[PDB]
Design a protein around this motif. Structure first.
Motif, short mmCIF file in Angstrom:
data_model
loop_
_atom_site.label_atom_id
_atom_site.label_comp_id
_atom_site.label_asym_id
_atom_site.label_seq_id
_atom_site.Cartn_x
_atom_site.Cartn_y
_atom_site.Cartn_z
N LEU A 1 109.19 51.69 -88.03
CA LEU A 1 107.76 51.74 -88.99
C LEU A 1 107.47 52.79 -89.10
N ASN A 2 107.83 54.14 -88.86
CA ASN A 2 107.96 55.19 -88.64
C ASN A 2 107.64 55.90 -87.33
N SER A 3 108.26 58.12 -87.55
CA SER A 3 108.07 58.34 -86.18
C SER A 3 107.39 60.71 -86.69
N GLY B 1 100.23 54.61 -89.75
CA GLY B 1 100.46 53.56 -89.48
C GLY B 1 100.02 52.70 -88.05
N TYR B 2 100.36 52.86 -87.04
CA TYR B 2 100.63 53.15 -85.98
C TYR B 2 98.92 51.95 -85.35
N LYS B 3 99.12 50.78 -84.49
CA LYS B 3 97.43 50.22 -84.68
C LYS B 3 97.99 49.48 -83.17
N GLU C 1 109.00 60.52 -80.91
CA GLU C 1 107.96 59.76 -81.25
C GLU C 1 108.36 58.45 -82.36
N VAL C 2 108.92 57.47 -82.18
CA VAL C 2 109.48 56.44 -82.94
C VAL C 2 108.05 55.01 -83.26
#
Ligand SMILES: [Mg+2]
Ligand SMILES: [Mg+2]
Ligand SMILES: [Mg+2]
Ligand SMILES: [Mg+2]
Ligand SMILES: [Mg+2]
Ligand SMILES: [Mg+2]
Ligand SMILES: [Mg+2]
Ligand SMILES: [Mg+2]
Ligand SMILES: [Mg+2]
Ligand SMILES: [Mg+2]
Ligand SMILES: [Mg+2]
Ligand SMILES: [Mg+2]
Ligand SMILES: [Mg+2]
Ligand SMILES: [Mg+2]
Ligand SMILES: [Mg+2]
Ligand SMILES: [Mg+2]
Ligand SMILES: [Mg+2]
Ligand SMILES: [Mg+2]
Ligand SMILES: [Mg+2]
Ligand SMILES: [Mg+2]
Ligand SMILES: [Mg+2]
Ligand SMILES: [Mg+2]
Ligand SMILES: [Mg+2]
Ligand SMILES: [Mg+2]
Ligand SMILES: [Mg+2]
Lengths: 193, 148, 99, 52, 203
Positions: free
Chosen positions: E115-117, E51-53, E130-131
């Motif tokens: 959000l996630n990791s 989900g990273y942008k 990594e988060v």
RNA sequence: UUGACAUUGUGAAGAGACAGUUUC
RNA sequence: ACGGACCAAGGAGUCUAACGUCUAUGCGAGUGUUUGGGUGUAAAACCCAUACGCGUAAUGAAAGUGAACGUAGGUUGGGGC
RNA sequence: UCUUUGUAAAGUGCCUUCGAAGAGUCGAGUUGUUUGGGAAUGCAGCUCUAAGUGGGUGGUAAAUUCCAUCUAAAGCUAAAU
RNA sequence: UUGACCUCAAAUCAGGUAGGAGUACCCGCUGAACUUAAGCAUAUCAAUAAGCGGAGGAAAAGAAACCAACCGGGAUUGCCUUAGUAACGGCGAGUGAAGCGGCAAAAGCUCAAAUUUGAAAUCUGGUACCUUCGGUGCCCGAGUUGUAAUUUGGAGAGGGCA
């Protein structure tokens, strides 16, 4: 302690159970609240009938497959056969289930005819225009009830060939019980020339 | 109601019906099923034989709906016809027009043979049937058709 | 195939008119694609083999497939994965030896 | 609070008692004994026109 | 694109290329602070699929956590109770190290939302994660309907409440018979199964 | 405290047993 | 032998879940409206579908099988008619 | 009351190729804990570590044949509680 | 020498944000013993009290890597049942779910993996103006180590035809 001739009881009350006692004193109050919520929603969505049209499905398991009941939603095949898209059916009050499949023609035709009846008995107001008069009917379920299909006629002729239904059941049970060992026996007999 | 209980009658009497010597205490023999093998053994063996020990094999994740098979006897078979066609069918026992009884629709899985149906042909549709039940139906002139 | 029409037996159950629903696009979740076969081939020839894959290939050459399968069942978790991995090592050995 | 407050009565017994009470309303002696000043009522049961 | 090659190559963790890269990167991470900002995702494809942008308001942190069991913190190993509770050394934390990593990063960066990791590395002493975090205050996140759900206050410290992917796994939030104890929350299920329900007309 | 696996990589010698493997 | 100087007021077999015997009541091979819906003079009263519980079949660890030779038998008592 | 707009947007039928679908993750061993879950229900630590007609599940461990069912390892969502 | 890039800093830099309280209910972690077993250690109490972290008006869960084995159902939740049952347990004391069925409420969806490549079509900020929960022009910046459109498996996409 144990005494006298009494059944062995299993009253599960050895935890802090009095901390988690729910008495439904509010049964009448919640019935009133549910009726108020239904009246409010009916007014909000008027003249829509408060519930979507549901398909007819066969209940699973041997215990209940003799009955039909309301399902979640019509299949994509059923909606396509009725002649409309799933996106539009969901906007005109048809429950649509993408994960149910059709393998039973009689169920499929029953649900397609159910959709045909709904589309014949429905009036859809234009997106822009003057809406005609329409009294609000509240229950799609009451308008299109689920009917149990007729399985046989009331009376007919006795057609007996002396096959002994009991013998039929016994032989089917035996054939299933010995299907594997007979296949193996035939396999080695075939191998041995 | 409290006014009808022996507690009201026991007012003024010291021991409240529990005895001066025995002298009602908390749990004089233990709690629940304590001592079933030791000091309650006689009661256990006399009133609940078979209580201790294992018998049979286990069934992991048993679903009772697999074993659904309610039984109907022949002596109740004719109650599955509504009473207002019942007498009409009972007279004029006809092989060409015999009543159809769908016992699965009535909610039964197996027809049993407690016996003595009237000598009238009937078509009995059932998932299962006992041998004697089928013999009595055929003796009456009917037939058992198997359904699923 | 078809239900017999009685409550017990090999094909017990009610006989109804079959319809054969259209195939879901799922049920093809594991299907290979040209894109993915090209990517996996290129990555395999870029990265090479793992130490246990090297050990498996050595075991296939020396000791045979039975001992290779046993070691691959130890390294992976299951016999079916061991068989698939040994088959893939065998294809690697055959491609390296051929021509 | 979890003392039993409401009491279940069989529907048929409830209807039995209601029917008996209704029939008792037509007995002059029962109404008078119950305490109503019906000594000068013409007849029991007392039926008046639907205009009421 | 190249993300498919990245996805397939990342799975080759014992190839020579990835063994070399892992040794160099694990030394580099061990030299830095236990928690530190990462300029860019180390695994951009993994961040994407989590989900990273690559826009303003998306932040990556790198955190290492100590590996192993959870030693029971009792003085001198004395547990004052029954023998069944006398264990000290072979006890395991019920949350993963990646949940510990997410929570420590969230505490460091309380203004953001985890959000996630993902895992990036490990040695005998530390696992490295990594988060991905999102800034709920950045207008680029407050707009962009695809992401302003995380600005809702109900998503405060979701890593602390176990609402991330690792949190839901450790909570056992999954469908089917294998998760009867934990579908709707195990404490809620236990309350439901241990509640005495009495009606006005007693059943 | 003792052993194993992981952290853990790179040269050689060379006990060898024997395209190579394998302990030492 | 122990408690009790005196008086007032308070002060201890209760409620609940499940159950045994007995009794009353309704209906009866059935029975149970009150999860819920309808309705209301509104936590009352009144009305109701489908299910579900128990019962009308047992026995076996189980796969399974499953209750009339006969005026539903014979003998001996047996109230009442 | 204004307005604007189709060469915007969306929908549907037939023919063709295609159809990318989440890795220290699934899974396995072991340890601890937990569960009604019993040759091991979930969780977690360590070690090992996949595949793509694949993978998970199908409540007795294993090998060999099938069959059924879904599509993990990324995410949002009102009401009945 | 000059100008970039990367990484890392500093500022009372421009604008923000976190902490604490409450905590009945909710999401997790940690975690007893009294007690019961007429003793007691597994067990029980109890996956509870106490301790710690984190929310909201509800929370959580949620549109199946589900249930099943049927003529099949079809997100989640809750009630009535299943059922004091299957099963667990010094198989002792005790403990103990789930599928089906009736009902309340109902609602569905979103990314990642695909070249816009005949045009980064995307976004923060600053500034000026304005119809100010915002809009337009301009500028710097972010961003190709990928921001938009397009697709999410129920599908769907390139081409043709209509
Ligand atoms: Mg006396
Ligand atoms: Mg006295
Ligand atoms: Mg005394
Ligand atoms: Mg005594
Ligand atoms: Mg003894
Ligand atoms: Mg203990
Ligand atoms: Mg004394
Ligand atoms: Mg004295
Ligand atoms: Mg005194
Ligand atoms: Mg007094
Ligand atoms: Mg996937
Ligand atoms: Mg614990
Ligand atoms: Mg959520
Ligand atoms: Mg400042
Ligand atoms: Mg004790
Ligand atoms: Mg004691
Ligand atoms: Mg003691
Ligand atoms: Mg607490
Ligand atoms: Mg608040
Ligand atoms: Mg929520
Ligand atoms: Mg889906
Ligand atoms: Mg469901
Ligand atoms: Mg029962
Ligand atoms: Mg327990
Ligand atoms: Mg489109």
């Amino acid at each position: 302690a144990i005494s006298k001739n009494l059944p062995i009881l299993k009253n599960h009350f050895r935890k802090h159970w009095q901390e988690r006692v729910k008495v439904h004193f509010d049964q009448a109050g919640k019935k009133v609240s549910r009726r108020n919520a239904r009246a409010t929603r009916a007014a909000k969505i008027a003249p829509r009938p408060l519930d979507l049209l549901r398909p007819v499905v066969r209940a699973p398991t041997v215990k209940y497959n003799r009955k039909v009941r309301a399902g979640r939603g019509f299949t994509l095949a059923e909606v396509k056969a009725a002649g409309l898209t799933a996106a539009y059916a969901r906007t005109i009050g048809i429950a649509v289930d993408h994960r149910r499949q059709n393998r039973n023609q009689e169920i499929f035709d029953a649900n397609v005819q159910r959709l045909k009846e709904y589309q014949s008995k429905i009036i859809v107001f234009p997106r822009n225009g003057k809406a005609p008069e329409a009294e609000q009917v509240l229950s799609a379920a009451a308008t299109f009830p689920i009917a149990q299909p007729a399985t046989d006629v009331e009376a007919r002729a006795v057609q007996d060939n002396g096959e002994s239904a009991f013998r039929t059941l016994r032989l089917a049970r035996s054939e299933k019980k010995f299907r594997g060992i007979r296949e193996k026996r035939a396999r080695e007999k075939a191998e041995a020339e | 109601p409290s006014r009808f209980t022996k507690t009201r009658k026991h007012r003024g009497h010291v021991s409240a019906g529990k005895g001066r010597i025995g002298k009602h205490r908390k749990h004089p023999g233990g709690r629940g099923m304590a001592g079933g093998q030791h000091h309650h053994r006689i009661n256990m063996d006399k009133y609940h034989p078979g209580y201790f020990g294992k018998v049979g094999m286990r069934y992991f994740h048993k679903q009772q709906a697999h074993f659904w098979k309610p039984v109907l006897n022949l002596d109740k078979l004719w109650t599955l016809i509504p009473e207002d066609k019942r007498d009409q069918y009972l007279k004029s026992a006809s092989k060409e027009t015999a009543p159809v009884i769908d016992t699965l629709a009535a909610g039964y899985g197996k027809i049993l043979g407690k016996g003595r149906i009237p000598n009238v042909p009937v078509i009995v549709k059932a998932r299962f049937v006992s041998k004697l039940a089928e013999e009595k139906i055929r003796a009456a002139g009917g037939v058992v058709e198997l359904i699923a | 195939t078809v239900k017999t029409g009685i409550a017990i037996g090999l094909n017990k159950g009610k006989k109804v008119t079959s319809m054969t629903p259209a195939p879901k696009i799922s049920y093809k979740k594991g299907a290979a694609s040209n894109r993915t076969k090209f990517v996996r081939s290129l990555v395999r020839e870029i990265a090479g083999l793992s130490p246990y894959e090297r050990r498996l290939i050595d075991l296939i050459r020396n000791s045979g497939e039975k001992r290779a399968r046993k070691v691959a069942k130890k390294r992976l978790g299951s016999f079916t994965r061991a068989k698939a991995k040994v088959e893939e090592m065998n294809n690697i050995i055959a491609a390296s030896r051929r021509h | 609070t979890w003392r039993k407050w409401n009491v279940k009565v069989n529907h048929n017994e409830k209807r039995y008692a209601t029917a008996s009470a209704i029939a008792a309303t037509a007995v002059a002696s029962l109404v008078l004994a119950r305490g109503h000043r019906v000594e000068k009522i013409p007849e029991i049961p007392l039926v008046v026109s639907t205009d009421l | 694109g190249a993300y498919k090659y990245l996805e397939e190559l990342q799975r080759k963790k014992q190839s020579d290329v990835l063994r070399f890269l892992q040794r160099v990167r694990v030394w580099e991470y061990r030299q830095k602070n236990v928690i530190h900002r990462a300029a860019r995702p180390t695994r951009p494809d993994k961040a994407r699929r989590l989900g990273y942008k690559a826009k303003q308001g998306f932040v990556i942190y790198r955190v290492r956590v100590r590996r192993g069991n959870r030693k029971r913190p009792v003085p001198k190993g004395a547990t004052y109770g029954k023998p069944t509770n006398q264990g000290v050394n072979e006890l395991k934390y019920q949350r993963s190290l990646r949940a510990t990593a997410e929570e420590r990063v969230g505490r460091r960066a309380a203004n953001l939302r985890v959000l996630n990791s993902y895992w990036v590395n490990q040695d005998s002493t530390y696992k490295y994660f990594e988060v991905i975090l999102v800034d709920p205050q950045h207008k680029a996140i407050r707009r962009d309907a695809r992401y302003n759900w995380i600005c809702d206050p109900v998503h405060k410290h979701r890593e602390a409440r176990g609402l991330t992917a690792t949190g839901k796994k450790s909570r056992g939030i999954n469908k089917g018979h294998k998760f009867n104890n934990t579908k709707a929350g195990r404490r809620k299920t236990w309350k439901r199964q241990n509640t005495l329900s009495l009606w006005r007309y007693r059943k």
